[PDB]
Amino acid sequence: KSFLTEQQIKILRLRARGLKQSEIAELLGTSRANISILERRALEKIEKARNTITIWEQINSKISVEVRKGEDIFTVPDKLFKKADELQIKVPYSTAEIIAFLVEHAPISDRIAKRDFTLFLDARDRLRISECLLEE
Amino acid sequence: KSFLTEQQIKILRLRARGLKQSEIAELLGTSRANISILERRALEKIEKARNTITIWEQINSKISVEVRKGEDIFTVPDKLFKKADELQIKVPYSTAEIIAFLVEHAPISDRIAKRDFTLFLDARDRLRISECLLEEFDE
């Protein structure tokens, strides 16, 4: 059991096969507007689900450090490394790997944060980003 | 933002710091039963979210093959391998790697499946298992 209805999974699957919203509406015998709304609602539930798994894996993080809007991306690896020594736990990434990770996934605008976010280490030692700032 | 309330996030965090459900009930000033019911509902929503992402990546899967209750786990690599050549795409896993995956994750009872499930290849080329059989959705 999931957060998607059977109807939403069917529409998403038919979309994945390349069918237009108007084509799918005819197969299911409902308005094209209803199909568009149903697809939009499903994608929103998937994003909501994706953020939920992010908050769960963040709650169980080895080490997490917070980056504020406007900070420099290159100052971040030290923040993580300093807190990692405070907890005496190893961060299995070079300063460059952390940066190349932040370029691909962080809300940045050329080395500057455009929003607050937290960078953390997965329980599986993956690097991850979340936009929920948890107080501690 | 997500499917978790601010209350459920606080409780999960306190559990992750090792507290007992009764300790948490005191901190939030409510019954221990309420804390357990809120914690159970939160983990259930996380599993529900985890299954929603699986179905999403299954809908966009490279290659998928379906296995029914009673089939032999050892016949599965051939089904996947034949279906990958019909689509002319590579599966970066040996027959043994596929087997050792199904032993760890599939609903099997000694090399025989106790329920239907779908084995598929992630968009990131990971191996994955899902229990929703969506190949009927093809006409």
Numbering used by the authors:
A (entry chain B): 4 to 139
B (entry chain A): 4 to 142
Question: What's written in the study?
Answer:
We determined the 2.8 Å resolution crystal structure of the wild-type TON_1525. The dimerization of EnfR is mediated mainly by the flag and stem helices with a contact area of ∼2300 Å2, covering one-third of the molecular surface of a monomer. Two benzyl side chains of Phe6 in the N-6 regions of two monomers form π–π stacking interaction to stabilize the observed conformation of the N-6 region.
Monomeric TON_1525 adopts a novel ‘eighth note’ symbol-like fold (referred to as ‘eighth note’ fold regulator, EnfR), and the dimerization mode of EnfR is unique in that it has no resemblance to structures in the Protein Data Bank.
